[PDB]
């Protein structure tokens, strides 16, 4: 049994519209980009490194990271679809297999608990009963808590430097200057002399 | 007489302490690392310590066939026990270089009819035997009875 | 996370921080004392004396101790980007 | 449901503020200081599992 | 210890700290009534308070176990058992009674 | 490694078997 | 052993602290009136109150264990079991009675 | 949902503010005040040297209480959270 | 040790050292309670407890070792060794007791 | 005890250091008590992390025993020794517990 | 010895810290290999790699082991066997063949 | 020198300054354990440790230099050189052995070409 | 001499110069052993190091002289000649030694 | 290394195989 290739072409032209919202749900592109905007936020200047460029960085990162997945899609569905061996939906059901445990890897416990309670499923049993759709809110929720988790951490030395320069220049005497107008170079600087953007990449990479 | 010889501090104050604590009167031999008992006594003592883990061919046969028959005797103070025989087959000095060997012994026990040894029991003949040999492990102890039947695991 | 795991990582960052204002802290006040005890010594009336001796001896202290604090920071920092995989879980 | 969750981010703030104001540190902005704090209190408490689960109450209730 | 060990309470206790404490009272306070039965000389309650999860494929509930020293030659009768392992799972929530192991001082185990 | 346990295991089985062979033949 | 007992504790009381006070202020009234009836000398009332958890489809119940201390020889009535188990279950928001276990001073269950 | 509901939250919300910041506030002034009553009475005058352990003092602060406000926040947030499906009008 | 180490006023301690504390402490009991069994002079108990995650899938099980020192002769029943089985695998949460060692004085497996 | 030596906070690693020291310690203290051990001495190796790949690796330990004068260890020994050693260890593979004497004889 | 460690500053760094840690580890091996009958001193020196990055299949440590025996006290090949187990152990991913144990007069006595 | 190098640390030391002491330590001790070799008299021992870099075409490797001292007539045996050969190499992370040269008093290389 | 002298306290120093300090100490230690060597009464060592970059633009190779003044008639063997050469390659982080040259007393290259 | 463990291997199944045929030819 097969579909049509008509309705072949339908649904693979269709799918197409979901790519954007598979990006951001289900992919890595989500986290990365709430660390770096929070790190615009930490940084003293909200909007130094255009959006397009922390975007286009963002969508290298999360392929890079991806990578493996892909690579293990092409080898399960795509190239046994391409090759006309198996169909369309069989295809597809066994390339959700390394996105499901590249999923679940990130997923928080409570997370899934908390949207198979909602989903009244019951007895769930092996990691290998979570339906997508009760994995995937879960997992965009997980994500939003790690990103939230690696914000909040980014923002510590920036702090750190502000208090230190903030008190030393009130201790001094001069209470009447900004504090963060002297204190952003001295952010930079941070930021330059420690490798900041490599560090981040490499430290965003290894959360995986 | 000798209960037991040539003891280390440790083992020797651990003997002491136990014989203190059974009323049993204790000589310890000056600077012989040794500590002579109530001749009577001797057997069912050094049995007694062994179930609470404490401590030329001709002339090394003749040993060898000495410290059997002690063993023997020793072992034969246990109730159940009609008679012992103990073999000790430590290899004459490894004459081959390369390959390693380690001292053995095997114990049989003539039972009284109707009667068995306990496992402590057991494990007091064991660890009595393996402690009167040097670097005969434990392990290298096989006690069987009149019957063959293995009695240590 | 835990409480634990934010308060332990606070103290810890705190603890950086204090270490590098103290020198400079430190220098400002024992610097502002010595002139306003000087100052009542000699019963000057003047609130601006202490001000220049502050800024010196930030300054100095600044020249002086800039390569170890900086060297401090850095490498906390360091260590905090390369933990940062693993504070998440 | 909104404004009653406003309030401890403002709380938080107020706060904040206030600490910064009793040393005289009252040149350096709260809002910056604020929300890091802000984002450790979401991640702390649950942010995302209390709200859902609130919310699913909120219709079923 | 148990409900007394709960009164000087420094302000710094975190949460973890919080509830290790309140084990320690439980296990005290089980302990002590284990002791008020006529042949019970002396108790000693542990319990194992873990994570829940949901994956049915792996759920490790709670567990107990109870060691307790009798008057020279008081032994337990089994119906005696059967009310120590009641009073035990009962006051751990969700404790199923057969995750309740109860010993005496000689090592033999009076449950299963 | 494994193979000395294999050895032992073996030997433990040679040795039993001759033991119960012993046991019968011997009244 | 107390209502008031616990009515104190200075203050920076994490909840946690005020549930947990709550319980045993309830055990010490329960056991209180347990004593009260005639045949009883002494009572302790142990809860075991769940946290709630969305892990499970529904949510389980608590439970609760009762030791009595008679008068020499005054054995509780049938009734007087049913009484206790009452008693006990209905102090406890959502007690299911089988959820009472009640003990005398020689470890018989009465329940 | 009535009036004095919404009056009870706002003034337990302020009242947990309150408590949030008393420690800090309070630690501030009496380190404050010492200095002034020190400076008066070594007749010292400079704006500056009050600044200087006011700083130290609030940051050992938060070293010592520090966990108990995150806690008693984290609770005030985590019962508001749970307690908002009840008091929906 | 045990409680008493546990409360030992201290203010200079992270959640590690406070788990690695309660880890000790819960070792001190077990040891203690082992002791108190008539056949056993002292005992020593060590667990290895695995570093907990929050949502990871992988799941891993704990695991103790138990050395007890017998009074001279005091060989433990069989029914004995189930019994400090059951009470160590207990006292960890999700310890299957298949991960409990009991081991002698001499350096027998019981 | 060494852990509790009254020392203000130095880092993470340094605490690491330590528990790794502390384990050590008691792990041969426990294979003294043990009859014919007169003096033990454990090494632990704890794995490191790698960077981008996901590879759990399992810790090793190296165990050297000192013998009463002569007196030889069972075989049942050298698997108790392996499973305390192990136990104590999370995720410890007991193949990767060895075990020497005072001569250098790989008792594993 | 571990005591290093222990009596240290405040101002040391991360580096300062593995070096130290490092040369610790050093001296506790050699302890213990003197601590083996035929052995009089041992030295060892370890070269742990930094941090990859740079690298691909990142790479693993190695280990020079200097023995000084008593009079005549050769080594026997399970010594050597021994003392490899050890010091590969010590180190976390040291592969024994990475390992060079020498003697008091420049003889290799592994490979 | 070498672990005795590294105890009177003042506060202002740049990374560069910690990783050259470092070196110059681990040079210290080798040295040592070489003379601690009953021929040899006294040892002194140069690394050449060069940061990374990606590119293979472009990638060279840690080298060391020893240059010995004998005791009056005493040869080092094969034996030997391919000792101190194993102990340099093992003591520099990644040090491939055929980049440690051994040279003697005179001049002679005791090592390969 | 080298060594010693990148000790000498200083604070008023920038990169720059603890580089060219480097520079200098580790050309008199390799003078210094060079002059230890039998045939040698004095060494003299200048290295040519390339300031690098972090970026990707031409890696190139560092130099050396090496100036030997010999005791009366003590000409050096080609193996003297090559163990120099191994010497100084060495010390230096990717020296090749093709770019070591060796020049006597007399303006003599033993190269 | 792995080849001389091979070859004590051997060596011991082989005396082990002459031990069992000398216990026999001995009485």
């Avoid at chain 1, 929070?38 to 397009?52: D, H, Y």
């Avoid at chain 1, 198996?86 to 997370?111: H, N, V």
């Avoid at chain 1, 001094?172 to 170079?185: F, N, Y």
């Amino acid at each position: 049994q097969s579909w049509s290739l008509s309705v072949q072409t339908l649904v693979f032209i269709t799918s197409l519209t979901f790519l954007p919202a598979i990006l951001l749900m289900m992919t890595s592109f989500t986290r990365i980009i709430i660390v770096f905007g929070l790190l615009r936020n930490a940084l003293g200047t909200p909007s130094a490194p255009p959006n397009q460029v922390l975007l286009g960085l963002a969508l290298f990162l999360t392929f890079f990271i991806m990578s493996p997945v892909i690579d293990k899609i092409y080898v399960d569905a795509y190239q046994p679809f391409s090759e006309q061996k198996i169909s369309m939906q069989e295809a597809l059901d066994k390339g959700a297999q390394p996105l499901r445990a590249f999923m679940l890897r990130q997923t928080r416990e409570a997370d899934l608990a908390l949207f198979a309670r909602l989903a009244n499923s019951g007895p769930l049993q092996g990691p290998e009963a979570v339906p997508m759709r009760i994995l995937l809110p879960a997992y965009v929720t997980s994500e939003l808590k790690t990103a939230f988790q690696i914000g909040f951490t980014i923002f510590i030395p920036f702090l750190i430097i502000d208090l230190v320069i903030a008190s030393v220049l009130m201790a001094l005497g001069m209470m009447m200057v900004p504090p963060a107008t002297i204190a952003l170079p001295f952010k930079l600087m941070l930021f330059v002399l420690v490798d900041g953007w490599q560090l981040l990449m490499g430290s965003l990479a290894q959360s995986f | 007489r000798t209960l037991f010889s040539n003891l280390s501090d440790q083992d020797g104050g651990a003997i002491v302490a136990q014989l203190t604590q059974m009323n049993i009167p204790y000589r310890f031999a000056n600077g012989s690392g040794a500590i002579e008992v109530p001749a009577d006594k001797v057997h069912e003592l050094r049995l007694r310590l062994a179930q609470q883990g404490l401590p030329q061919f001709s002339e090394q046969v003749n040993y060898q066939r000495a410290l059997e028959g002690e063993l023997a005797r020793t072992i034969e103070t246990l109730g159940p026990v009609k008679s012992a025989r103990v073999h000790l087959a430590m290899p004459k000095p490894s004459l081959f270089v390369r390959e390693q060997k380690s001292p053995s012994a095997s114990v049989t026990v003539t039972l009284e009819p109707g009667r068995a040894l306990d496992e402590g029991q057991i494990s007091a003949v064991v660890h009595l035997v393996s402690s009167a040999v040097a670097g005969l492990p434990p392990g290298n102890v096989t006690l069987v009875d009149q019957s063959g039947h293995l009695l240590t695991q | 996370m835990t409480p634990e795991s934010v308060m332990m990582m606070g103290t810890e960052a705190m603890k950086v921080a204090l270490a590098l204002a103290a020198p400079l802290l430190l220098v400002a006040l024992i610097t502002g004392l010595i002139i306003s005890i000087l100052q009542a010594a000699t019963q000057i009336n003047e609130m601006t004396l202490s001000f220049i001796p502050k800024i010196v001896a930030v300054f100095i202290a600044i020249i002086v101790a800039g390569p170890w604090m900086l060297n401090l920071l850095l490498d906390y920092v360091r260590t905090l980007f390369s933990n940062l995989p693993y504070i998440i879980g | 449901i909104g404004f009653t969750i406003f309030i401890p981010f403002l709380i938080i703030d107020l706060v904040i503020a206030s600490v910064l104001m009793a040393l005289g540190m009252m040149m350096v902005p709260p809002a910056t200081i604020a929300l890091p704090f802000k984002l450790m209190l979401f991640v702390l408490v649950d942010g995302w599992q209390l709200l859902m689960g609130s919310l699913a109450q909120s219709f079923y209730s | 210890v148990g409900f007394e060990l709960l009164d000087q309470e420094k302000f710094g206790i975190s949460q973890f700290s919080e509830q290790v404490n309140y084990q320690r009272a439980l296990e005290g306070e089980l302990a002590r009534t284990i002791e008020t039965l006529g042949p019970v000389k002396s108790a000693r309650v542990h319990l194992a308070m873990p994570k829940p999860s949901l994956f049915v494929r792996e759920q490790k509930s709670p567990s107990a176990s109870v060691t307790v020293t009798l008057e020279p030659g008081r032994a337990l009768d089994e119906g005696q058992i059967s009310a120590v392992v009641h009073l035990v799972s009962s006051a751990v929530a969700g404790l199923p009674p057969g995750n309740v192991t109860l010993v005496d001082q000689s090592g033999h185990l009076l449950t299963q | 490694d494994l193979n000395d346990a294999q050895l032992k295991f073996a030997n433990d089985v040679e040795s039993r078997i001759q033991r119960r062979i012993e046991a019968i033949l011997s009244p």
